[PDB]
Design a protein around this ligand. Structure first.
Ligand code: CDL
Ligand code: CDL
Ligand code: CDL
Ligand code: CDL
Ligand code: PLX
Ligand code: PEE
Ligand code: PEE
Ligand code: PEE
Lengths: 140, 53, 55, 104, 459, 69, 121, 347, 56
């Protein structure tokens, strides 16, 4: 659960690239498993083997996205010696988008995923820096 | 939401069964009558926010 | 190249295409109660082991 | 029917000059058309335009610019005669400003 | 200032209570009277604005825009009573109701002292324009034009509401006087950067900016004549007025944050001026000319110097008048020929001499001929930009050259040459069209006589 | 024109003074209200944000057929 | 919901006796005029839907519409004013009761407050 | 169905929801829910056909499952504190059960699947009842236990509801499914502000009920259940089309129309306590609802679709049974924005 | 012949009476902002022997 996000976050950003990549790929694998479960429940695969194939496809794609994102972000933050910079997360997000485009074999999907995933990862980094809240606790 | 008509009219439609220390038949007490009574007395006055601290 | 093609492609046409795809994906259910009741079960398991586990 | 609709034929343009050689291009009925022209001309060119322009041209000097010129004349006269600088660099009195005590 | 608002809300039932053949006369007469009354706000104190009440105030920037709107309504009524002759009485009254409601919302927009009220009216101006465009258009593309016009505005202006409510939660007020007196600098943080973006992008897409201008050609071509007039004359100036009002809170972030918008504005001004040359349509050329002029206004507002502000105000007023006149001139030819192609009807000077003169005057005022207020605004903006950076003069001069080129190109193609030999239904010009042209053009010259009325509050 | 249509500058001056006072008071009151709401929801001791508890009048203080309770 | 539970609050009163110490809204109140205008609009829409002469079909019906809207609006405005007065009263009582959380800070003049200057160039 | 039986079933439905809204005991609330469902099932099947039968079956199955989860939540909360009063509900697992059960009863996503189908399978009167009246009791229970409820769970379902409502409404041509998806999207907005301020929830509920009532009553007036069937009423009752277009604009969230007031107030309330991202997402998503409302308006009044020859015979007849409250609902659905400060009379 | 002309041109007074009503409402709005009349530090001035208000 949220313990996986603790695993990803408790690691200092520009250190231990292998562990951070492992945490990111675990998060991606969990997300892919959830997506595949919903897809099977709502769109039956007509056979057990095809359902397993679809589950494996979704899980592997999501795990690849997570691994590439984490690895690229950590490496870019380490070589530039400048942590706390949204550019690193943007590069990681575009790397994940290129991975998605390669997995689905679509150049346009790849470019769009680069752009949008890089943007959203950059905003996630800025929210981490400035302390933005998605589900803010009631304060008034 | 909660249109409190029992409090307005003084009817007691379903308040007799809410708690454990409220007028059981033949005066049979609940297993935790004293604890619930103590909690209710301390609890009733301050409000919900202070009642948890 | 700029107005009639690319400035149309980036902001409005991309938005229309994405919303079309998502509307199609959401709004194709065969109506069988079995499938989305299974989805309800998946939602129940998720919620109980992703939200209230940490308090 | 080798067609798709029970559709009216597309009407051809109606010329205002055919039934009215002096039309003014406002309406079909000549009297209301002439009066529409008359009111448009009287309230656009006669009332709003000329009277409005002569009203705007004679607005009182609420912008305080002749007043500003007179103020400048008197201040220049007084300052130059006394030997004082024509204009002073500090807009406010330095005595009423409390700068930070030190910068170390 | 209810002495202007209430007469419009009385224009409504008076229009609805008129005889079947007296609606145009009454509407025109009383709208002209209301514009004459609104001409009384030009008396502005040099010190501060006129604060009539807690809700409404008038500034030196608001008064020319108010006068322009009140003067615009009668011209729109005059231009609309040609293609609506076959309409029923109820639909004519509904059209006039839309025009009157648009004027009322515009009047209440330029004088609202509170930013949320300004936003509410600024967005209330969307419903009547949309109804007009999508109900009284002519081609099948009016539906897409209306959808683009609505969604480009809304997708950029919804974040503005969040920004404004957050501002009121933080500072404690949204009244413009309190905002201006209690203004404080904005630090360099991502939160403040997105605050800048939220406050700016709504007015940017209302200008429009070069990258967000795709809705303007569709809306201005597919709308009826009154819709095009009101879009190109006043509805575009809402964004400029909004930035000139909202920029006070933004500094010092704006100096750092204006580089992409300035670059887009300058280069897109060049690009749209070049696009005007290779245009096969007549209304699209005027739409792109509007885009170029409004990009110049964007540059003026963004560099944020007093000379730039005065130039922006003058250019806004001058462009409103000129673009309205050009749209009416194109509409007359469209009514004659029933097509929008430029090269269809040629050599109209030999058939319509007075319209040839009106075309010449409109084109001359479009390319900033001295000493018209168009040139005053353009020159003030150019001088302010030159002070900002000496290299901008290259882009400004190139824009001036291309503007002259496409203006004279349109004038020569539509008016000079030989006639088309097969259009024999070009009737002589009516009195209504000539009167509309004169009422468009005379105020421009009367204003260049006394240019201090339209130079804004920085004068 | 100035005698017939307009007034003196002092009227506008004092009107905008009063308007500024009103708006400043409203701004201060809004900020104070936000702070008061935050404190009263955090603490819970204020009149606002009171959540209902169990009335003590429902308890029965009578012998309970067993000595202890 | 901050004010749903409050001390000494009769459940379904809609107008406590404590609200009679506030000045009632004037009968020429602009909000009441807007309520009457809403009633008139509803009457006109009623006439239009039933395919009747919109302006002058039923005068008694339009009068009833207007008077019903005004009658409800009077009490709605009374309750709204009572609730806002109650909010302000509670706010002032709380700020007085807890002086340490709302201290009176110093009053510096601009002659000694140092604000950084940002040139425009 | 006999009129006495119909009116007593309607009164039993209202009695069940009132029993929910006026009870302090959890058991009485559950009894009110059971009574509401029991008397609500036949109302859907007033006009018998296979579609109505299967709509009633799906509705019954969903509501029975929700009631089972709700009673399990009540029993667990009793287990960890011998209390029956509807209060904080401290226990996290029991609170999760109650929140999910009430979401399933309301139609919030991901439990939103049943609403479009049941709405399409029943008549316009039953659809009106289902979409307006059947939201009061779960919302009342949610408002009572709002402080106890977890923000993350509540927020996630509200955002999902808004997104899925918009995307589903983008596709449908049938009017009843459009109304159902719009109802889901509005439920998202109302449950979004629930943890922060229940007064905004009540205000949004009131305005949504008014708008939905006006829209359904106009749809009943011009007896059309599809887009093309609604495209004919311009040739019979143009005033109805104009009023419907104005109401559809109001539903979209445009200002100066009233519909905007709940959206504006919810954004303002969520901003008071440092929730900036969520209101922005909800507004940009409600743009989709506006889009498909606008498509319906284009089809309905702003254009003129081809008509049929038999409409000439309808031209000669008047609508016999007239809805008395339609004009008031239209006026309250459109022109009530200037009276925003009167929302203080709700707390 | 006052009958027909009045019953056909009674609408030509709505705008003028609206203007008069607007002026009257503006005057009333001015009447509620007299909190600093003859109290501003710039225009503070002793009254004339007969007048009672600096402005209305
Ligand atoms: C308090 C609240 C909590 C409540 C919950 C409490 C639950 C706990 C107690 C439950 C005890 C069970 C008692 C009775 C249950 C009733 C069962 C029933 O009635 O069956 C009807 C139902 C309908 O029967 P039918 O339609 O008449 O006959 C259809 C034909 O048989 C064949 O049909 P077909 O061949 O024509 O169609 C193809 C095939 C399709 O089948 C498939 O394609 C299977 C695909 C699954 C993927 C395989 C995994 C591969 C990767 C795994 C990775 C693991 C992590 C490692 C890291 C990454 C490495 C990759 O069938 C389907 O289309 C249906 C799909 C259903 C599959 C199983 C459903 C489980 C939940 C839904 C999620 C699906 C899993 C996705 C992946 C999730 C992660 C693993 O039967 C079935 O759906 C299949 C048989 C089910 C038997 C097992 C049921 C027990 C499990 C229940 C779920 C609860 C979780 C269990 C414990 C969890 C820990 C807490
Ligand atoms: C706001 C004002 C106005 C703005 C509006 C206007 C501007 C915006 C709109 C225009 C830009 C949008 C283009 C982006 C991608 C769209 C392509 C597309 O639709 O995909 C589906 C489309 C068709 O979909 P499909 O059905 O799956 O494929 C069927 C194909 O027919 C089958 O094709 P094929 O298999 O026969 O052959 C294709 C294949 C074989 O390749 C070729 O055939 C020809 C080679 C083309 C790409 C190879 C790269 C070498 C050329 C790049 C040279 C430098 C670029 C300029 C920098 C100058 C430096 C001073 O291509 C590749 O394999 C290349 C893979 C990846 C290479 C791309 C990396 C280069 C990016 C440039 C970096 C610049 C950094 C910043 C520097 C500037 C600042 C100082 O795919 C393509 O065919 C084209 C893909 C390759 C085009 C790359 C062009 C990118 C230009 C720079 C992008 C940066 C701007 C965006 C920022 C965020 C992105 C990170
Ligand atoms: C400086 C000159 C001194 C003149 C003194 C008095 C001038 C009074 C003019 C009043 C306003 C003009 C009315 C505009 C619409 C024209 C009405 C019309 O259709 O005429 C039919 C009428 C009947 O003849 P028709 O047989 O039926 O002809 C039918 C065809 O249309 C055939 O028609 P067409 O072939 O005869 O052509 C029509 C004609 C008339 O149509 C126009 O194009 C006139 C518009 C002029 C330029 C428009 C854009 C430029 C912006 C300039 C803004 C400055 C305005 C100053 C204040 C104006 C007050 C309203 O256009 C032209 O002839 C050439 C136009 C190119 C003008 C180039 C001059 C550039 C600026 C020069 C300096 C301006 C400031 C002066 C002081 C500078 C510092 C010392 O013919 C005329 O009466 C023509 C009017 C006289 C020509 C005026 C040209 C110069 C005046 C410029 C502004 C006035 C300055 C006043 C200050 C005194 C110095
Ligand atoms: C902010 C300031 C105030 C502004 C507030 C907003 C405006 C006012 C409030 C609105 C509600 C009031 C009226 C609405 C219901 C009226 C129903 C209607 O259809 O009217 C037709 C009716 C004409 O029918 P008729 O005379 O029986 O015979 C012809 C047949 O009806 C033949 O009829 P037909 O059915 O055969 O005609 C077909 C037509 C029939 O369809 C229609 O006529 C459309 C009906 C309007 C929609 C109602 C919307 C509900 C209210 C929401 C307003 C939204 C405001 C926000 C801004 C956005 C605008 C959308 O359908 C079409 O043509 C389809 C074209 C599609 C166009 C799409 C536009 C539709 C929406 C436009 C709404 C504009 C706002 C309302 C303005 C007034 C319009 C009457 O008009 C009237 O005669 C009454 C109008 C009001 C009279 C005011 C008089 C006041 C008292 C007189 C003296 C004044 C003071 C004296 C004292 C002086 C001191 C001494
Ligand atoms: C079609 C036209 C539509 C409108 C276009 C609007 C343009 C909006 C773009 C915003 C301009 C600037 C935004 C942020 C300001 C600085 C950007 C960056 O270049 O500065 C560097 C920042 O380093 C990195 O570049 C950060 C940005 C990297 C991630 C952002 C994504 C940018 C890629 C392009 C995305 C596409 C944008 C348009 C979407 C459609 C300097 O580093 P540093 O001085 O230490 O930090 C500056 C910020 N501080 C001071 C608040 C801390
Ligand atoms: C937040 C992160 C956002 C992630 C950005 C990814 C969005 C990529 C969309 C770009 C367009 C991709 C594209 O080319 O569309 C086609 C592509 C597949 O091709 P088909 O048309 O199905 O071909 C079938 C025949 N074999 O369709 C898609 O899958 C794209 C539509 C899904 C959009 C996903 C958007 C999700 C964002 C909201 C979720 C919350
Ligand atoms: C992630 C969720 C974010 C939600 C943001 C959505 C913004 C709202 C825009 C609405 C898009 C809906 C358009 C759509 O999907 O329909 C496709 C539609 C097909 O027409 P139909 O008549 O419906 O189909 C009939 C064919 N049988 O395609 C079109 O014609 C497009 C017409 C309208 C285009 C308007 C474009 C406006 C968007 C510009 C940018 C702003 C959008 C909002 C996001 C902005 C980004 C900050
Ligand atoms: C025609 C289409 C045009 C589309 C334009 C849309 C983009 C508008 C720009 C962003 C709008 C949202 C910004 C939020 C509004 C202001 C809120 C604010 O100022 O608060 C910020 C919050 O800032 C944010 O949350 C921003 C999150 C952004 C999420 C949505 C991003 C939308 C797309 C991003 C890129 C768009 C920008 C450029 C687009 C150019 C046009 C294509 C500070 O948070 P605090 O609670 O005060 O805490 C700080 C102290 N601890």
């Amino acid at each position: 659960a949220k313990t996986l996000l603790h695993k990803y976050s408790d690691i200092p950003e520009g250190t231990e690239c292998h562990r951070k990549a492992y945490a990111s790929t675990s998060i991606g694998g969990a997300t892919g498993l959830i997506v595949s479960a919903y897809s099977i429940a709502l769109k039956p695969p007509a056979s057990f083997l095809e359902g397993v194939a679809r589950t494996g496809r979704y899980t592997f794609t999501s795990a690849a996205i997570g691994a590439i994102f984490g690895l690229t972000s950590c490496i870019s933050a380490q070589v530039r010696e400048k942590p706390d910079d949204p550019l690193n997360y943007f590069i990681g997000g575009c790397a994940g988008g290129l991975t998605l485009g390669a997995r689905t074999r679509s150049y346009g999907i790849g470019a769009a995923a680069c752009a949008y995933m890089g943007l959203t990862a950059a905003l996630v980094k800025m929210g981490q820096l400035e302390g933005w809240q998605v589900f803010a606790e009631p304060k008034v | 939401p909660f249109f409190d008509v029992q409090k307005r009219l003084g009817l007691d439609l379903d308040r007799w069964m809410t708690i454990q220390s409220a007028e059981q038949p033949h005066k049979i007490p609940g297993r935790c009558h004293a604890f619930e009574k103590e909690w209710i007395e301390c609890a009733h006055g301050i409000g919900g926010i202070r009642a948890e601290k | 190249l700029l107005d009639l093609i690319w400035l149309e492609t980036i902001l409005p046409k991309t938005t229309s295409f994405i919303q079309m795809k998502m509307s199609i994906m959401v709004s194709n259910q065969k109506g069988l109660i079995k499938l989305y009741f299974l989805s309800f079960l998946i939602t129940i398991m998720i919620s109980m082991t992703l939200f209230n586990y940490h308090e | 029917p080798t067609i798709r609709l029970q559709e009216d034929p597309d009407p051809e343009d109606e010329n205002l000059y055919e039934k009215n050689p002096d039309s003014h291009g406002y309406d079909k009925d000549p009297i209301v058309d002439l009066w529409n022209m008359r009111v448009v001309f009287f309230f656009g060119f006669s009332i709003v335009l000329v009277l409005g322009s002569t009203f705007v041209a004679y607005l009182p000097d609420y912008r305080m610019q002749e007043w500003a010129r007179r103020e400048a004349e008197r201040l220049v006269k007084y300052r130059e005669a006394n030997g004082l600088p024509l204009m002073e660099s500090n807009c406010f009195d330095p005595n009423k400003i409390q700068l930070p005590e030190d910068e170390d | 200032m209810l002495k202007i608002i209430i007469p419009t809300t009385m224009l409504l039932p008076m229009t609805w209570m008129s005889k079947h053949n007296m609606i145009w006369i009454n509407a025109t007469v009383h709208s002209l009277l209301i514009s004459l009354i609104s001409l009384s706000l030009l008396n502005q104190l040099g010190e501060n604005s006129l604060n009539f009440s807690l809700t409404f105030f008038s500034d030196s920037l608001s008064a020319p825009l108010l006068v322009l709107t009140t003067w615009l309504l009668p011209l729109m009524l005059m231009a609309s009573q040609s293609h609506l002759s076959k309409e029923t009485t109820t639909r004519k009254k509904l059209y006039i109701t839309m025009l009157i409601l648009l004027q009322l919302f515009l009047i209440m927009t330029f004088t609202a002292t509170e930013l949320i009220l300004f936003y509410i009216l600024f967005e209330a101006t969307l419903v009547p324009t949309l109804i007009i465009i999508t109900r009284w258009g002519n081609q099948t593309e009016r539906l897409n034009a209306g959808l683009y016009f609505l969604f480009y505005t809304l997708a950029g202006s919804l974040p503005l509401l969040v920004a404004l409510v957050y501002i009121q939660n933080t500072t404690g007020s949204l009244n413009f006087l309190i905002i201006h007196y209690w203004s404080h600098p904005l630090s360099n943080s991502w939160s403040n950067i997105f605050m800048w973006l939220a406050c700016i992008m709504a007015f940017m897409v209302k200008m429009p900016l070069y990258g967000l201008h795709l809705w303007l050609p569709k809306a201005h071509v597919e709308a009826p004549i009154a819709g095009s007039m009101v879009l190109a004359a006043v509805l575009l100036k809402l964004g400029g007025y909004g930035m000139m009002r909202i920029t006070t809170i933004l500094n010092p972030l704006t100096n750092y944050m204006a580089y992409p918008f300035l670059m887009l504005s300058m280069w897109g001004m060049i690009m749209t001026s070049s696009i005007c040359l290779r245009q096969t349509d007549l209304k699209s050329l005027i739409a792109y000319s509007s885009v170029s002029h409004m990009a110049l206004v964007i540059v003026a507002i963004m560099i944020q110097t007093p000379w730039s502000f005065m130039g922006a105000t003058a250019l806004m007023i001058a462009h409103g008048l000129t673009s309205s006149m050009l749209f009416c001139l194109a509409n007359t030819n469209y009514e004659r020929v029933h097509s929008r192609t430029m090269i269809l009807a040629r050599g109209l000077q030999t058939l319509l001499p007075l319209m040839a003169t009106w075309w010449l005057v409109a084109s001359l005022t479009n390319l900033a001929l001295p000493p018209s207020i168009n040139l005053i605004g353009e020159l003030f903006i150019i001088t302010a930009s030159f002070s900002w950076s000496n290299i901008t003069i290259i882009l400004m001069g190139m824009n001036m050259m291309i503007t002259a080129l496409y203006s004279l190109y349109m004038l020569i193609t539509t008016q000079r040459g030989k006639y088309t030999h097969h259009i024999n239904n070009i009737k002589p010009s009516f009195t209504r069209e000539n009167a509309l042209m004169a009422l468009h053009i005379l105020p421009l010259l009367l204003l260049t006589l006394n240019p201090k009325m339209i130079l804004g509050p920085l004068y | 024109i100035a005698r017939t249509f307009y007034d003196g500058p002092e009227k506008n001056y004092e009107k905008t003074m009063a308007i500024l006072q009103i708006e400043a008071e409203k701004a201060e009151l809004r900020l104070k209200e936000l702070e008061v709401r935050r404190l009263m929801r955090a603490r819970g001791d204020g009149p606002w944000y009171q959540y209902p508890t169990i009335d003590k009048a429902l308890i029965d203080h009578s012998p309970k057929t067993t000595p202890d309770n | 919901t901050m004010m749903s539970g409050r001390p000494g609050r009769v459940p379904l009163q809609f107008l406590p006796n404590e609200a009679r110490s506030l000045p009632p809204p004037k009968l020429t109140d602009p909000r009441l005029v807007y309520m009457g205008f809403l009633g008139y609009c509803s009457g006109l829409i009623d006439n239009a839907i039933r395919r009747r002469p919109v302006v002058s079909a039923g005068l008694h019906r339009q009068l009833l519409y207007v008077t019903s809207f005004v009658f409800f609006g009077y009490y709605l405005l009374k309750r709204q004013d009572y609730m806002y007065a109650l909010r302000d009263h509670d706010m002032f009582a709380y700020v007085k009761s807890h002086p340490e959380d709302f201290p009176e800070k110093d009053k510096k003049t601009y002659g000694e407050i140092l604000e950084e200057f940002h040139p425009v160039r | 169905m006999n009129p006495i039986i119909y009116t007593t079933l309607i009164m039993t439905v209202m009695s069940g929801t009132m029993l929910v809204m006026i009870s302090s005991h959890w058991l009485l609330i559950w009894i009110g829910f059971e009574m509401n469902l029991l008397a609500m099932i036949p109302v859907l099947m007033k006009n018998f056909n296979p579609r109505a039968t299967e709509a009633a079956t799906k509705y019954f199955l969903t509501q029975a499952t929700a009631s089972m989860m709700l009673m399990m939540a009540i029993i667990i909360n009793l287990l960890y504190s011998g209390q029956w009063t509807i209060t904080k509900m401290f226990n996290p697992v029991a609170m999760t059960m109650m929140t999910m059960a009430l979401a399933m009863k309301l139609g919030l996503s991901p439990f939103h699947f049943w609403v479009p189908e049941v709405t399409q399978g029943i008549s316009l009167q039953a659809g009106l009842l289902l979409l307006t009246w059947q939201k009061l009791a779960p919302l009342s229970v949610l408002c009572q236990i709002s402080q106890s409820i977890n923000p993350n769970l509540m927020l996630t379902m509200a955002m999902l509801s808004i997104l899925i409502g918009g995307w589903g409404g983008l596709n449908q041509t049938q009017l009843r499914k459009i109304m159902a998806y719009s109802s889901i999207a509005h439920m998202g907005w109302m449950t979004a502000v629930l943890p922060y301020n229940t007064t905004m929830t009540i205000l949004n509920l009131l305005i949504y009920i008014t708008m939905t009532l006006a829209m359904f009553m106009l749809l009943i007036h011009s007896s059309a259940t599809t887009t093309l069937s609604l495209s004919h009423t311009w040739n019979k009752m143009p005033v109805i089309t104009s009023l419907m277009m104005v109401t559809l604009l109001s539903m979209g969230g445009l200002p100066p129309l009233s519909g905007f007031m709940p959206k504006w107030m919810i954004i303002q309330e969520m901003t008071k306590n440092e929730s900036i991202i969520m209101p922005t997402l909800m507004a940009m998503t409600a743009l989709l609802n506006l889009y498909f409302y606008m498509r319906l308006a284009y089809s309905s009044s702003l254009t003129m679709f081809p008509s049929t020859n038999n409409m000439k015979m309808k031209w000669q007849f008047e609508h016999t049974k007239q809805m008395k409250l339609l004009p008031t609902m239209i006026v309250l659905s459109t022109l009530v924005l200037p009276m925003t400060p009167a929302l203080s009379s709700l707390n | 012949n006052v009958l027909q002309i009045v019953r056909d041109h009674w609408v030509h007074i709505l705008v003028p009476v609206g203007f008069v009503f607007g002026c009257y409402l503006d005057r009333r709005s001015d009447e509620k902002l007299t909190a600093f009349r003859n109290k501003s530090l710039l225009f503070k001035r002793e009254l004339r022997p007969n007048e009672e208000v600096t402005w209305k």
